[PDB]
């Protein structure tokens, strides 16, 4: 194991001082990293020196503790955001809102510093990831909301709603934090892959939904001037019909009849419509098509695709682990709220190599010899050799026997 | 039973979880009994303690069912699936909290701090999973000129700055929850069922021995009446030679059969045939070449 560890990483003057792991990652082999030895080395680097004066420097620069500090800071910021949105706000912001906006803008500054490290290549690589794009969009929306909040009464309520709708993205961004976990990262990738089948189901569900809604709306309300309520009514009830609310009251009202009512004066009933029973019939057919067929088909699709997706997701996560570890290795010690000071600071043997080479040469020779021996041990090789010798021997023996007649 | 070093006995006893849960339940029952007898204000608390405690005894029937051949593995399977249940629960909780906070903040723009907010965050969205969508409260008319019926006209409220976002988020949340995650969990269970089944069966077959011995060692009377039991408690060579000969014969037969099976392998025959043919061919060639001198 020690020889393999030494061979894995050591600066090469021949290849611009690049270790084997860096080449493998850049090559995107996707199998050299996943090997157990590489994972062990990655874990050892993840735990840094503490593989359980100088303590202050080594302990607080280990990636794991920095990751935990960032997570705790994010959780606290999320708690403050929740408290702010739930509680009423006066004309001027409180201390919590100042802390929140400072966090947001420090995060933006950190993103700018990271991208700054041609510029077009850097931008393309940065856009390769989607989390950064979503974070930038959310930060811009938050800035718009903050600007709107401070400008008098009529605009402040709009900024508040902007905050309320924005908090959802930060709530959902905890999946990135969960990505580190061994048993929980693949779940997110599986969900992301199943979203496509979700969309394909959604299209047909929408078609059927619209057909039923238009039919119901047209059969009833025969006379009605144009307006936008029709579009809302097309979608309203049928969508909720999927999740167990069928509106039993409105399925088929009695309509016209002579009803004396109870505990009140008799109320004359309306005159009904030309056709209504068609509405219950179509409702029954639509519910049968939707709540049973398509959902179970989606279940079958998920069952079929789960096994195929699982192993690929696991391998991909094992590969991304290296970039995660290095990213947390390069980051500053302090979390986003307090790294403004960090930004201010930033702006301001041969015998061993011979032994490793000899070990590698011995391994190469042994591997090639083993491969040759295994190939020779194949029954096909033995069968081919046996047939060839037998054929040659039989012909030689026949000639000797025929020639032996002259001796006789 | 624990009395039969003491630390080893305690560790082995704690190896099982049923005993730990039983001890905790007994302690809770004792606390409830003590609280019940001390005047009016405390008795109602002891009664509630009893009511909440009875559930553990109700659920403890799984241990009794463990003996059954066809029913024991079910319990182990459930216990193994609880982990996937928890993993689903975490993400469900995240989405639930996001939707609840959004809904609460969009409505009730002005409200002093209180603990009702936390309850309201969780109340409706959790029940939305199991088929109750609260159709009345999805989107009330809010502001309008409504004359009402069978009563004086009631002026409608002034609405809020934004509400339609609430139905939109509700639709998205229901689509994400009631369809995607549950079916994913179904797929997980389907995949893991076959793997878990055989292991559970084998483990139950192994635990059967300890079950039998435990019931073999216990006293005859049941717990209510074993107080009297506690009071009482405190107060051939030829056959062996034949078995050994049988075992030796079995060992010899098994080894001979294994050797014969190995020799019957086609690989052994192929290797032997090739070796003899190669040696024979070389010997024959030498004889043929040497035969020239005789000629
Ligand atoms: C091709 C397939 C589709 C073919 C036909 C689609 C159905 C079209 C129905 C339009 C009928 C117009 C109408 O309202 O007349 C109605 C009678 O109509 C009927 O009772 C005949 C039954 C028609 C249904 C066939 C069974 C479906 C086959 C299943 C396969 C009379 O109107 P009303 O509903 O009784 O309301 C009273 C009206 N007043 C009194 C208030 C004025
Ligand atoms: C990034 C993605 C998210 C981007 C934006 C998220 C949505 C933010 C909406 C905040 C608008 C503030 C507001 O209330 O103004 C409203 C008009 O707002 C609109 O009608 C514009 C439509 C906005 C929705 C875009 C479609 C979603 C894209 C889908 C993709 C006016 O308020 P009101 O609701 O009409 O209530 C009346 C208020 N009074 C009269 C009582 C005072
Ligand atoms: C006007 C009304 C707007 C409606 C707002 C939404 C309603 C809120 C309730 C529920 C929303 C739930 C949405 C489901 C999100 C599922 C995302 C998911 O799990 O897939 C993830 C996909 O990852 C990604 O690519 C990142 C995409 C995340 C975008 C999510 C944005 C939804 C939130 C909307 C809020 C509005 C602001 C959005 C700004 C863009 C996990 O896969 P991965 O392996 O990590 O891929 C990373 C690639 N490097
Ligand atoms: C304040 C409100 C409290 C809420 C109370 C709960 C609500 C009551 C309603 C429903 C509760 C149902 C809980 C599900 C229980 C599932 C347990 C199960 O089947 O898994 C079992 C796991 O076995 C175990 O390890 C024992 C664990 C049992 C603990 C159950 C306690 C739940 C009851 C709560 C009542 C409060 C008292 C609890 C005291 C600890 C079966 O697996 P096994 O193969 O037998 O493993 C044995 C290892 N030697
Ligand atoms: C998965 C895909 C889902 C997409 C479906 C989106 C369709 C949503 C349309 C619903 C519009 C609506 O009903 O309200 C419009 C409101 C009037 O409200 P109301 O009084 O009719 O209830 O005020 C207005 O009149 C504004 C109308 C503006 C609507 C323009 C949207 C067109 C976008 C299509 C691209
Ligand atoms: C799967 C994980 C689920 C965990 C979720 C648990 C959160 C439950 C919190 C709900 C508390 C609550 O709303 O009631 C508190 C009551 C006041 O009741 P109400 O008038 O607000 O309805 O009286 C109080 O004010 C007492 C508040 C004490 C709450 C402290 C709980 C903190 C535990 C976190 C660990
Ligand atoms: C098959 C999948 C893609 C489901 C797609 C259905 C959605 C497009 C439907 C379901 C519920 C509908 C909503 C139900 C109610 C309203 C309120 C409506 O705003 C008002 O009613 C104005 C205020 C008022 O008059 O009361 C705007 C549309 C919205 C969000 C509807 C728009 C379209 C929604 C989100
Ligand atoms: C995929 C296909 C089937 C398109 C979707 C079908 C319908 C949901 C859409 C298509 C065109 C839409 C119409 C486009 C134009 C108008 C007129 C307009 O009403 C007005 O002019 C009055 C405005 C007011 O007083 O408020 C708004 C609704 C309506 C019928 C729209 C309502 C919904 C319609 C019928
Ligand atoms: C995703 C999984 C983990 C579901 C988790 C949701 C639970 C944490 C939620 C669902 C229903 C909630 C309960 C709904 C109502 C109440 C009553 C509340 O007590 C009172 O209301 C005081 C008396 C009163 O004022 O009426 C305490 C919390 C509790 C049990 C809530 C606490 C949290 C619960 C159990
Ligand atoms: C995982 C993260 C998102 C934490 C969970 C989010 C919220 C559900 C929690 C986080 C902090 C909580 C707050 C902590 C402190 C307070 C003030 C406190 O209210 C009072 O001081 C008045 C007490 C009274 O009059 O009864 C109780 C509710 C509130 C807003 C709590 C309600 C719910 C909050 C916002």
Curated annotation (Swiss-Prot), chain B:
Residues the record lists as binding 1,2-dioctanoyl-sn-glycero-3-phospho-(1D-myo-inositol-4,5-bisphosphate): 69-70
Extracellular side: 38-41, 109-125, 154-163
Transmembrane segments: 17-37, 42-65, 81-108, 164-189
Subcellular location(s) of the protein: Cell membrane
Side of membrane Cytoplasmic, spans: 5-16, 66-80
Disruption phenotype: Trpm3-deficient mice exhibit clear deficits in their avoidance to noxious heat. Trpm3-deficient mice display reduced hypersensitivity to thermal, but not to mechanical, stimuli in carrageen-induced inflammatory pain. In the chronic constriction injury (CCI) model of neuropathic pain, intraperitoneal injection of isosakuranetin or primidone do not reduced heat sensitivity in Trpm3-deficient mice.
Intramembrane annotation, residue ranges: 126-153
Its job: Constitutively active, non-selective divalent cation-conducting channel that is permeable to Ca(2+), Mn(2+), and Mg(2+), with a high permeability for Ca(2+). However, can be enhanced by increasing temperature and by ligands, including the endogenous neurosteroid pregnenolone sulfate and sphingosine-1 and suppressed by intracellular Mg(2+). Implicated in a variety of cellular processes, including insulin/peptide secretion, vascular constriction and dilation, noxious heat sensing, inflammatory and spontaneous pain sensitivity.
Binding partners and assembly: Homotetramer. Interacts with TRPM1; the interaction results in the formation of a heteromultimeric cation channel complex that are functionally different from the homomeric channels.
Annotated family: Belongs to the transient receptor (TC 1.A.4) family. LTrpC subfamily. TRPM3 sub-subfamily.
Stated name of the protein: Transient receptor potential cation channel subfamily M member 3
Species name: Mus musculus (Mouse)
Lineage: Eukaryota, Metazoa, Chordata, Craniata, Vertebrata
């Amino acid at each position: 194991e020690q020889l393999a560890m030494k061979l894995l990483t050591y600066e090469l003057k021949n290849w611009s001082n690049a270790t084997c792991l860096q080449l493998a990652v850049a090559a995107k082999h996707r199998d050299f990293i996943a090997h157990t030895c590489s994972q062990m080395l990655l874990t050892d680097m993840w735990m840094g020196r503490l593989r359980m004066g100088r303590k202050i420097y080594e302990f607080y620069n280990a990636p794991i503790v920095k990751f935990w500090f960032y997570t705790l800071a994010y959780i606290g910021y999320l708690m403050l955001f929740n408290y702010i949105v739930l509680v009423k706000m006066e004309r001027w912001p409180s201390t919590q809102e100042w802390i929140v906006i400072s966090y947001i803008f420090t995060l933006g500054i950190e993103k700018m510093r990271e991208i700054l490290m041609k510029l077009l290549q850097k931008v393309k690589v940065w856009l390769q990831e989607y989390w950064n794009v979503t974070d930038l969009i959310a930060i811009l929306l938050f800035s718009v909301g903050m600007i709107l909040r401070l400008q008098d009464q009529p605009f402040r309520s709009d900024g508040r709603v902007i905050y309320c709708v924005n908090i959802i993205y930060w709530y959902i961004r905890l999946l990135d934090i969960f990505g580190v976990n061994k048993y929980l990262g693949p779940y997110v990738m599986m969900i992301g892959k199943m979203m496509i089948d979700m969309m394909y189901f959604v299209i047909i569900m929408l078609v059927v939904l619209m057909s039923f809604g238009v039919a119901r709306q047209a059969i009833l309300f025969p006379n009605e001037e144009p307006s936008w309520k029709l579009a809302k009514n097309i979608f309203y009830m049928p969508y909720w019909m999927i999740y167990g609310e069928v509106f039993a009251d409105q399925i088929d009202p009695p309509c016209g009849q002579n009803e004396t009512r109870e505990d009140g004066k008799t109320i004359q009933l309306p005159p009904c419509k030309t056709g209504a029973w068609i509405v219950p019939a179509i409702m029954a057919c639509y519910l049968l098509v939707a709540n049973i067929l398509l959902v179970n088909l989606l279940i079958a699709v998920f069952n079929n695709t789960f096994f195929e997706v699982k192993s690929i997701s696991n391998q991909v996560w094992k590969f991304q682990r290296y970039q995660l570890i290095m990213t947390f290795h390069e980051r500053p010690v302090l979390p986003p709220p307090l790294i403004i000071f960090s930004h201010m600071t930033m702006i301001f043997t041969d015998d061993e190599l011979k032994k490793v080479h000899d070990f590698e040469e011995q391994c190469i020779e042994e591997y090639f010899r083993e491969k040759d021996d295994r190939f020779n041990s194949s029954n096909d090789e033995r069968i081919r050799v046996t047939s060839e010798r037998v054929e040659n021997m039989s012909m030689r023996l026949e000639e000797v026997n025929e020639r032996e007649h002259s001796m006789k």
